[PDB]
Design a protein around this ligand. Structure first.
Ligand SMILES: Nc1nc2c(ncn2[C@@H]2O[C@H](COP(=O)(O)OP(=O)(O)O)[C@@H](O)[C@H]2O)c(=O)[nH]1
Ligand SMILES: C/C=C(\C)CC/C=C(\C)CC/C=C(\C)CCC=C(C)C
Ligand SMILES: C/C=C(\C)CC/C=C(\C)CC/C=C(\C)CCC=C(C)C
Ligand SMILES: [Mg+2]
Lengths: 442, 194
């Protein structure tokens, strides 16, 4: 007999849901976590090569052809949605407090590169590299330095370290002005450090930009090389790890289990449970991804193209790096948004020996999405295979307070997971009424 | 505190067969009648002496994920040996072993070691899986076989020792060296490292 009643039902095993399921199980809540799909990870799963053909190709190749070209399916764990972890980001903080580090190992990403006039340049990760970089001239570097010294010396508490700037009242452009920074330096700080994909931030309060730049500097400072970490065996390990945390603390899991019907309190539209092939399960609230409640979500008005490329060689002009980010700032291509490339390889157990995965992504701004990626495809050298997908981004219409249907946002075009942990924290506050407070797992 | 080899072991098998009790009997030498835990066992570490070698075992438990056959594929990563448990009083749990074998074939390395354990052998009146049938099955699927009782301790230490020996003795020198303490630095980042 299966228990009918739970504190919370969670639908979909994307990482946002799996983190929430783990945190709530840790809080002592009785959680039932269901997925219609036959595997963990939802839209940000890592999949095998055969699955990649099934998903993105018209006529999947034979097992024998696939294995001769690419080796065994077991060697491939290919992210559907590229993300790195900021080394001092919130996801690392959650991983450490929950000991989900016991279920997922991490390696540093070798570097972050920025595109300028057809070439790529490694963004400095230390003082020697900062001295060496041709990205700025000497006098501009001196102005850059005073800016970063202010970033380091600013204490909220103490108005004497503010240099006449107010992070809430001054725009980021005004902050740049105080330090006399030119437009190319603004683009570099904004796009390579704050990692904005557009220039909207210039006319917005400085605070969020200040915090993002501080986050970047703290992250590169943790271990050097770059601000990023990446999980061994791919991003799919993350939801699996948080699902294990939830199971340890009492959570119950069902996969390959369609939701036949969502149940609502009569004449109210409020959640009460779900009917499945295994029975009817009840809880006072549900947490779910957009695919379970499409009617309760809206498009953000953005579509992201993601091109998963398989190479049999390293990316040119990266010193044969095992992993990297490339950033193509919008101004370099006359675009409205940056193009990213995320490159990982056999060093991270995501492909067979000798191969590289290069996943290119951007928000579509033209009528020929494939053509928008050409400047990025050109950076990769010869490409063995491409698997192309386009995703529309969704967000909940409402915060869930009215109907106890607490929905996550689709995974966005940003190159790392900070916006995903922002979503976790926001959903947790919505669900529980108090900010998330992490305790160290004992 | 130092060790010769470190092996990663998993327990697998249908819910209710006594995997968590088997692990607690081995690790803590305790048994709780009608065992139910609010927080499931994650893993236990136990160092054993094996033909004059110190073998550290990190033995993973399922955290209940087997109930509806939702074991995370990550569970099998880096495993060296897998102990498949059924209940000698429960024919279906024995039949379920064929399915777990298929999972292991799918998610674990081709060279993983396997062992079949028939648990609850203390329940003599209620036995339905005949020893010779289980043994012939284990033979036909390339694994040794023991019947155990977490309750009264029958064969529990020996089951875990059997597996640690299947591994240590089956491993190519390349594979065995990678399990040594000197080779524990895998080039991964310690997130709890200042
Ligand atoms: N008689 C007997 N009962 C056992 C034995 N091992 C476990 N049990 C009981 O079987 C039930 C399930 O045990 P548990 O360890 O949770 O099984 P799991 O679901 O495979 O982890 C509990 O009531 C245990 O007390 C055993 O060797 N003999
Ligand atoms: C506390 C540790 C310190 C101050 C040394 C490490 C330096 C960091 C974290 C800053 C990295 C600097 C940049 C990305 C500046 C870019 C510089 C140029 C393009 C010249
Ligand atoms: C917590 C760490 C932070 C905020 C980074 C601080 C880093 C600084 C001040 C170093 C920046 C260095 C350069 C831009 C290179 C300077 C080199 C020349 C002027 C030749
Ligand atoms: Mg158990």
């Amino acid at each position: 007999t299966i228990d009918t009643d739970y504190d919370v039902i969670v639908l979909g095993t994307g990482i946002t849901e799996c983190i929430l399921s783990g945190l709530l199980s840790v809080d002592g809540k009785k959680v039932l976590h269901i997925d219609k799909q036959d595997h963990y990870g939802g839209e940000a799963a890592s999949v095998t090569l055969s699955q990649l053909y099934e998903k993105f190709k018209q006529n999947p190749i034979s097992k024998e052809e696939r294995e001769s070209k690419f080796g065994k399916d077991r060697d491939w764990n290919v992210d559907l949605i590229p993300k790195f972890l900021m080394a001092n980001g919130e996801l690392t903080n959650i991983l450490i407090h929950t000991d989900v580090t016991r279920y997922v190992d991490f390696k540093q990403v070798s570097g972050s590169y920025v595109f300028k006039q057809g070439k790529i340049y490694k963004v400095p990760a230390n003082e020697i590299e900062a001295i060496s970089s041709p990205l700025m001239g000497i006098f501009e570097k001196r102005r850059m330095k005073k800016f970063l010294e202010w970033i380091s010396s600013y204490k909220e508490d103490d108005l004497s370290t503010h240099q006449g700037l107010d992070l809430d009242k001054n725009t980021m452009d005004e902050v740049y002005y105080k330090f006399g920074l030119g437009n190319s330096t603004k683009e570099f700080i904004g796009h390579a450090m704050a990692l904005w994909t557009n220039d909207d931030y210039l006319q917005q309060p400085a605070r969020p930009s200040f915090e993002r730049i501080l986050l970047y500097c703290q992250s590169v400072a943790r271990y050097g090389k770059s601000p990023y970490l990446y999980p061994m065996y791919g991003l799919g390990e993350l939801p699996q790890g948080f699902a294990r945390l939830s199971a340890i603390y009492g959570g119950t899991y069902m996969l390959d289990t369609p939701i036949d019907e969502v149940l609502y309190k009569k004449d109210t539209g409020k959640f009460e449970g779900v009917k499945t092939k295994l029975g009817t399960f009840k809880a006072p609230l549900v947490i779910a991804d957009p695919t379970y409640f499409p009617e309760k979500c809206k498009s953000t008005g953005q579509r992201v193209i993601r091109a998963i490329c398989i190479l049999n060689h390293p990316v040119p002009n990266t010193s044969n790096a095992d992993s990297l980010q490339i950033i193509i700032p919008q101004s370099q291509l006359g675009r409205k948004s940056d193009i990213y490339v995320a490159i990982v390889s056999d060093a991270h157990n995501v492909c067979s020996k000798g191969h590289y995965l290069a996943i290119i992504s951007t928000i579509i701004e033209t009528d020929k999405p494939h053509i928008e990626l050409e400047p990025a495809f050109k950076l990769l050298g010869p490409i063995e295979e491409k698997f192309m997908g386009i995703a529309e981004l969704f967000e909940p219409r409402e915060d869930g307070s009215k109907d106890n249907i607490y929905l996550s946002r689709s995974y966005d075009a940003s190159s790392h997971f900070e916006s995903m942990t922002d979503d976790v924290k926001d959903i947790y506050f919505r669900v529980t009424g108090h900010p998330l407070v992490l305790k160290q797992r004992q | 505190s130092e060790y010769d080899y470190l092996f990663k072991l998993l327990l697998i098998g249908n819910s209710g067969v006594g995997k968590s009790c088997l692990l607690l009997r081995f690790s803590d030498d305790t048994y709780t009648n009608d065992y139910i835990s609010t927080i499931g066992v994650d893993f236990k570490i136990k160092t054993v002496e094996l033909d004059g070698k110190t073998v550290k075992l990190q033995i993973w438990d399922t955290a209940g994920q087997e109930r509806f056959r939702t074991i995370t594929s990550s569970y099998y990563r880096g495993s060296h040996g897998i102990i498949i448990v059924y209940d000698v009083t429960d024919q279906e749990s024995f039949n379920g072993v064929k399915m777990w074998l298929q999972e292991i074939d799918r998610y674990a390395t081709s060279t993983v070691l396997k062992l079949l354990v028939g648990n609850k052998c203390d329940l003599k009146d209620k036995r339905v899986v005949e020893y010779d049938v289980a043994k012939e099955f284990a033979d036909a699927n390339k694994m040794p076989f023991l019947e155990t009782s977490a309750l009264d301790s029958t064969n529990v230490e020996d089951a875990f020792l059997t597996m640690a020996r299947q591994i240590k003795e089956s491993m190519s020198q390349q594979n065995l060296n990678e399990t040594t303490q000197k080779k524990e630095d895998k080039g991964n980042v310690n997130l709890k490292g200042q």
